[PDB]
Amino acid sequence: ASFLSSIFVPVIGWVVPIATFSFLFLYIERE
Amino acid sequence: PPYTFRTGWALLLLAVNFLVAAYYFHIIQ
Amino acid sequence: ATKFPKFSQDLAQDPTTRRIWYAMAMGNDFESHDGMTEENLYQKIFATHFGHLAIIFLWASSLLFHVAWQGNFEQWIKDPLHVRPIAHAIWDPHFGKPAIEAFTQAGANGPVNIAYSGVYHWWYTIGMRTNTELYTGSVFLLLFASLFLFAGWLHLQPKFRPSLAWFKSAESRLNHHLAGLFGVSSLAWAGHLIHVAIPESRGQHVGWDNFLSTAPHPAGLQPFFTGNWGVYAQNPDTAGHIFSTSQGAGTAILTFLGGFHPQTESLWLTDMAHHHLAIAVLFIVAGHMYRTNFGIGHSIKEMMNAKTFFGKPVEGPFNMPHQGIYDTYNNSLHFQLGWHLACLGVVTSWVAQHMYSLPSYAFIAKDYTTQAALYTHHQYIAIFLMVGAFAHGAIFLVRDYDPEQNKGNVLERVLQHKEAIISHLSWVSLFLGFHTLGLYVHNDVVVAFGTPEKQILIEPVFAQFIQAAHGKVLYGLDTLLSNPDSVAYTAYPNYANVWLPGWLDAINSGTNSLFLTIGPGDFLVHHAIALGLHTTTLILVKGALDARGSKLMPDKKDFGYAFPCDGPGRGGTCDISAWDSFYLSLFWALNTVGWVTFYWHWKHLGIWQGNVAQFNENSTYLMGWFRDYLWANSAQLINGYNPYGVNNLSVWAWMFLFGHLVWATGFMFLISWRGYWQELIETLVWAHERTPIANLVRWKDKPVALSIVQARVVGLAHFTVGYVLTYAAFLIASTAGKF
Amino acid sequence: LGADLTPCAENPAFQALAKNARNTTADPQSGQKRFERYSQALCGPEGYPHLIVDGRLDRAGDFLIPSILFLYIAGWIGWVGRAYLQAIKKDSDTEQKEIQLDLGIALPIIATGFAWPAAAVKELLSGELTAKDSEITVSPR
Amino acid sequence: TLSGKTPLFAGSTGGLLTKAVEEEKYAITWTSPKAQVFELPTGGAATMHEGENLLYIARKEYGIALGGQLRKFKITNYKIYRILPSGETTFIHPADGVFPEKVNAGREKVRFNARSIGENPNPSQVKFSGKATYD
Amino acid sequence: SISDTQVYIALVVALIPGLLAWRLATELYK
Amino acid sequence: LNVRPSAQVVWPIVGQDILNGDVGGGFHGIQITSGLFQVWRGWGITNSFQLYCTAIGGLVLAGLFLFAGWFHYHKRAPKLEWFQNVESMLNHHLQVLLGCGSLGWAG
Amino acid sequence: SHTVKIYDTCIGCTQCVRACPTDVLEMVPWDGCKAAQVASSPRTEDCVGCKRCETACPTDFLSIRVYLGAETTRSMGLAY
Amino acid sequence: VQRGSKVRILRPESYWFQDVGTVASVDQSGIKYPVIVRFDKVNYAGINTNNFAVDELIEVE
Numbered sequence A: 001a002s003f004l005s006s007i008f009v010p011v012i013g014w015v016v017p018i019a020t021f022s023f024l025f026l027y028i029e030r031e
Numbered sequence B: 001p002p003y004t005f006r007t008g009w010a011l012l013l014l015a016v017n018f019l020v021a022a023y024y025f026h027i028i029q
Numbered sequence C: 001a002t003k004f005p006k007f008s009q010d011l012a013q014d015p016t017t018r019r020i021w022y023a024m025a026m027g028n029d030f031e032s033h034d035g036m037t038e039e040n041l042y043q044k045i046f047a048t049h050f051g052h053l054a055i056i057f058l059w060a061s062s063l064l065f066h067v068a069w070q071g072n073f074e075q076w077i078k079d080p081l082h083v084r085p086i087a088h089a090i091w092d093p094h095f096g097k098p099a100i101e102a103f104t105q106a107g108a109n110g111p112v113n114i115a116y117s118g119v120y121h122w123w124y125t126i127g128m129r130t131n132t133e134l135y136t137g138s139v140f141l142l143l144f145a146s147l148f149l150f151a152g153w154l155h156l157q158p159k160f161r162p163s164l165a166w167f168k169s170a171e172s173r174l175n176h177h178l179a180g181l182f183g184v185s186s187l188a189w190a191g192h193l194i195h196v197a198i199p200e201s202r203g204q205h206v207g208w209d210n211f212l213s214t215a216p217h218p219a220g221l222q223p224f225f226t227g228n229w230g231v232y233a234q235n236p237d238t239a240g241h242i243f244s245t246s247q248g249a250g251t252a253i254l255t256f257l258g259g260f261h262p263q264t265e266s267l268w269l270t271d272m273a274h275h276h277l278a279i280a281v282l283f284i285v286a287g288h289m290y291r292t293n294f295g296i297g298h299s300i301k302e303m304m305n306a307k308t309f310f311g312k313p314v315e316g317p318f319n320m321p322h323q324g325i326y327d328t329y330n331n332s333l334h335f336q337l338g339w340h341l342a343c344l345g346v347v348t349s350w351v352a353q354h355m356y357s358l359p360s361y362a363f364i365a366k367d368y369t370t371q372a373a374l375y376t377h378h379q380y381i382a383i384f385l386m387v388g389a390f391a392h393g394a395i396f397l398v399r400d401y402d403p404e405q406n407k408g409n410v411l412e413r414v415l416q417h418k419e420a421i422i423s424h425l426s427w428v429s430l431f432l433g434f435h436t437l438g439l440y441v442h443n444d445v446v447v448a449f450g451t452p453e454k455q456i457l458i459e460p461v462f463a464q465f466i467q468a469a470h471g472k473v474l475y476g477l478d479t480l481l482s483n484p485d486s487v488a489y490t491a492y493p494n495y496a497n498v499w500l501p502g503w504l505d506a507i508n509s510g511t512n513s514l515f516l517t518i519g520p521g522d523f524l525v526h527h528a529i530a531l532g533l534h535t536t537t538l539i540l541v542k543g544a545l546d547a548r549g550s551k552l553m554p555d556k557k558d559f560g561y562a563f564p565c566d567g568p569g570r571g572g573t574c575d576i577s578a579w580d581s582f583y584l585s586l587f588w589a590l591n592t593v594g595w596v597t598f599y600w601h602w603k604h605l606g607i608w609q610g611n612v613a614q615f616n617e618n619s620t621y622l623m624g625w626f627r628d629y630l631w632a633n634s635a636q637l638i639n640g641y642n643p644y645g646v647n648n649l650s651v652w653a654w655m656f657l658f659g660h661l662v663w664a665t666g667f668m669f670l671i672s673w674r675g676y677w678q679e680l681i682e683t684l685v686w687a688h689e690r691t692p693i694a695n696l697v698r699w700k701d702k703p704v705a706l707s708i709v710q711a712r713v714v715g716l717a718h719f720t721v722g723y724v725l726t727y728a729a730f731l732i733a734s735t736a737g738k739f
Numbered sequence D: 001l002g003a004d005l006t007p008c009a010e011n012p013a014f015q016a017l018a019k020n021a022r023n024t025t026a027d028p029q030s031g032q033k034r035f036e037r038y039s040q041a042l043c044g045p046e047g048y049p050h051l052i053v054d055g056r057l058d059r060a061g062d063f064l065i066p067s068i069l070f071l072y073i074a075g076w077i078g079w080v081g082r083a084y085l086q087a088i089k090k091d092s093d094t095e096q097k098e099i100q101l102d103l104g105i106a107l108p109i110i111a112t113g114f115a116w117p118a119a120a121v122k123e124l125l126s127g128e129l130t131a132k133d134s135e136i137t138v139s140p141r
Numbered sequence E: 001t002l003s004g005k006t007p008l009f010a011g012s013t014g015g016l017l018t019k020a021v022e023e024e025k026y027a028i029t030w031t032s033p034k035a036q037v038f039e040l041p042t043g044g045a046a047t048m049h050e051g052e053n054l055l056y057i058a059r060k061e062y063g064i065a066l067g068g069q070l071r072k073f074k075i076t077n078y079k080i081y082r083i084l085p086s087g088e089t090t091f092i093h094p095a096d097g098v099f100p101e102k103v104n105a106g107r108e109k110v111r112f113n114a115r116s117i118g119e120n121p122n123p124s125q126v127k128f129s130g131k132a133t134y135d
Numbered sequence F: 001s002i003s004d005t006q007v008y009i010a011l012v013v014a015l016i017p018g019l020l021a022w023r024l025a026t027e028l029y030k
Numbered sequence G: 001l002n003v004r005p006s007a008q009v010v011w012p013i014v015g016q017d018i019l020n021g022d023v024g025g026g027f028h029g030i031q032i033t034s035g036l037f038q039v040w041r042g043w044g045i046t047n048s049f050q051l052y053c054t055a056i057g058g059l060v061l062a063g064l065f066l067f068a069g070w071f072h073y074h075k076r077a078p079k080l081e082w083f084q085n086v087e088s089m090l091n092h093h094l095q096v097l098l099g100c101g102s103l104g105w106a107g
Numbered sequence H: 001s002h003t004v005k006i007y008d009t010c011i012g013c014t015q016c017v018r019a020c021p022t023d024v025l026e027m028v029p030w031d032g033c034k035a036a037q038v039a040s041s042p043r044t045e046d047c048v049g050c051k052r053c054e055t056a057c058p059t060d061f062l063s064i065r066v067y068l069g070a071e072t073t074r075s076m077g078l079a080y
Numbered sequence I: 001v002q003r004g005s006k007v008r009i010l011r012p013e014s015y016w017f018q019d020v021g022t023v024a025s026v027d028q029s030g031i032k033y034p035v036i037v038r039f040d041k042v043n044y045a046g047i048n049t050n051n052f053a054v055d056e057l058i059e060v061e
Ligand code: CLA
Pocket: A009, A010, A012, A013, A014, A015, A018, C093, C094
């Protein structure tokens, strides 16, 4: 189960920020 | 006003203060 | 004209980067949202409160799950005084092998963080013995968080949105929250302690599988109904009792022993059971006071508006006009939020002061870092809640307070002599400040000149009297509980001081933090804390009572809570808003908790090392604090890493420097103000436009320097974050380093 | 009183400190004379005089006597200061008399400042100490 | 419609940015009796011509500032124009040909409150309403 | 410690408040 | 090499005489870090009398500077013409103040 | 944009109008004061919120007030 | 009130609210604030004069 750390920590570190900042950027610039 | 109510309550608090000081000074045990 | 923020057409039409910043700052300020009504405000707030509860239960679930999965709970059970509790696993790609080796600790197979939250102690005390139990706790708390999230959604749906009248039904909520949320919660916990924790404490496994079959007491609820209640106090746990084993265990479920369990050095579970049972009955009684739907009960509006004391006419409750106070409280959410932040802030300090001196969790008194962490944590929270109480009190005065509705009452009178209140606060602050700094500086100079016998050392004789009145015979005063002749000690008629034997054993042992011996060092620092509390109050009260206006800005209520200034006219009006008092107060709030936590920590470090002398002799001059506390206890922390290698304190060493950096960064926003930056950003905008390949790309939002208020927010945040991380690092590294 | 307080002349820590007592002034006996005086005080375990400030008459020298002497000098300063301010307010160029002292007015006031408690009581029991709340400027409520 | 030759030494990095092309631009015209040196709004010593001068400026505040400097040169015939990207020139100062500090008949009171500032309502009174306390 | 299965159940159970948190957040935005 | 430079002696009052440490040369005072002793040794000053002469000489020069300032303001104040001779000032300040000062000092 | 309100305590001194760096204000006929003129704010879209007008105003309390509202390109004083 | 009359201010937003000032002149016209009152102490702007309505004043002398 320890292997989940190798999946989740990179996701919370990179995937989640990129996805969140990408969406929020597109939302705050929507006209 | 003559300030009877507030002086009465202030005296009561100052009485308690003195009563606790009487315990402190071993006057009342 | 961009969509975001949806709640402000003013911000949505801002063409600059200020649009983005002010949307973040105003997102949760629902009153300030466009087309917000009172009913929609309460209904959104209620739904949001379900969201916050869910977050707390998901946070709580995380603690259980991560300890169940990655912790050493089952190992820690077997030796709680020597095993280090694990918080969670470390998975950091950036670690070198030396760091991985350094963080491989507490008998873990990989790198882990040691837990300093005292959750292991708490969970062990309340009867959890297996990772499976912790896991089941975590999955339950996910489902419990899930239930509140759904409730939040449901109570926004058309049919299930409560009316404004429902939200303003104060007396019904007071009955339900006192009797139900407090009273039954307390009774239910008393149930848990009696049915599970106390059996588990006596080596008896009681869980969901067998709790219906196994009776908490041999007598089995027959004495309760027949009223032979004393049966439940018969045969308490002995002084020989070894926690979580039958060796020396009793059968009593409701005792009243007083003092501590001698092995665990924590409050008896059977005392804590009887406490929560007694507390429950008192709260259930209290929540039958207010009228709801059955005629009987007190009306709080009637009590406030009452003008007759048994025929004799009075101005109101205690002959004080409280008319319109019920409506003021009930109608203003900022009045409530402020008032409830004050109460919670007091209770948080209360908890902190009591949890160190009267530990409830088995073996936590000997986990010195956890005790230090938990005291500092709750004192910092208390300080924020207290500043918030006054902040929202100022927001109430500037946004909600109706002078006409509060005509002639206690609140109008307080505002009438606000100059007298603020001037006397100014005096107490100055009076404390001059003489306290005076005595420290006197002491610091006479010690520096090699004459420490010339120090002004004041015995805290009034506090020492209270310790003696609680039966601490060290001082040799022989008064109240230290006098075995006193009616207090004997309880002359009834002689039912059954608490006292246990209490006197606890207070007269020097092996605990129950009424620590105090001297000149404790006197000077209590007077520094008083100075701290009065000056933070002075800033916040002045901020609150001048929120609506002052001589300098008579129409201040027209400009609201937060605004930069009223410009350089009339001599200059920087930091004139009520918000700017909150901003200034938090520096003092942090300064004050600094003095409180430094004092707590240095006194305890002495006690823990069996070297109280160090504090007792060196705490009377500020070089003693500087050298024997800050300098001395930085030694191990700052060697967390060095040229020679790393140890487990490398993370605290790095966080220590991080705190120092974030604090210092805050000074930039607090010292250098907007006009400098706006002129600098103008040249950057020029350069971008004129750079030949870069001018390809263009901003959607015009770059502007942060606002005057935003800079105070950002500055104060960096300062605060810096303050907390710096001390957290030092507090933990210095204690965990020694212990 | 409490917290391991003994008479300084009985505390071994005090005598140890007295034997190595540093001379405060040019007087070479100033070090010994200090510990001879401080012998009558209560000393803690480390042998430093601890002061008792609870109004105990046998410890009146500690805080009670210093308190009376301070309040008398501080009250003098405050009364003389108040007296001068009230004196110059009856003149034309009052602001100039603040930054540039009228010693003709000031020195007599300073001289008569010894009797400030009598003057303070007299002025308290004449309604001449304070102004009316209605006649003092205040902020809008 | 804007007549006047651009002053000598009018060049600097403090001039028009992309806003002048995309959002709006301002012009200030004035008739000088004599060619004379003047400080530009955004730095640099420019030279006025004898006769009609035209200076393009990013902000109206530049025009009012320069206007103030032209008054020190005994020049009061300066006209500020707002220019949109569609080339819609609008004369904006002085609005009605008379300088605003001088009283002119025909001007109506705008945003006048027939009360002392102390007589504004409390924020609580106008709570959950559209109106503000200064309305 | 706890089994790999128990960890996988917890993650699947944690999708429930995950979903409901999304639904509440979207509803609170209206 | 052994004696520590000290030129400030504290009065014995409120115990501050502790600051008069053992600085060597059977002398008690605050050790100075201004390098005055190394300056005076470089000057070739070898006794206290030469310092007394130099100190008095300085007090006379300070007196002269006070008089000059009073004189050149209250009594004989140069006109703006005088001040704006930047070429003459540079000549006199390069040749006399710096040049003749440096020649004098070489001497 | 910012809101600039004039109050009936105006004495028509014209100092606010002269102070204004973006010609927001102007004097208009009035019968309320001896000067027979009152300040007006017809061009508040040009107001930057500097409060020079308030600093100029000699009345106690002020007869002109600037309430800082929605920030625009003109109100933020941006040349970009 | 007329010229020379000492008056106390009742205007709550006035710097001199409940402070005494001397009436410098009373404008004999229909203006809302005809009474010019001078003060000994200057306000935060540094002015020592202000116009008041008769209802905002209490003659003390
Ligand atoms: C929060 C989570 C997080 C995680 C899990 C990582 C993980 C990593 N960082 Mg760190 N980093 C982070 C935050 C994080 N970073 C932050 C906030 C900063 C700024 C303070 C940094 C600053 C930083 C620097 C300066 C460096 C790293 C490097 C690394 C790598 C070192 C391991 C190695 O030696 O193998 C070697 C591993 C690789 C050579 C890369 C493996 C493949 C990459 C990760 C992705 C491949 C493409 C991918 C499939 C799709 C696109 C990418 C993305 C959208 C997912 C590792 C992948 C080092 C590195 O190697 O950089 C590339 C490095 O020099 N990081």
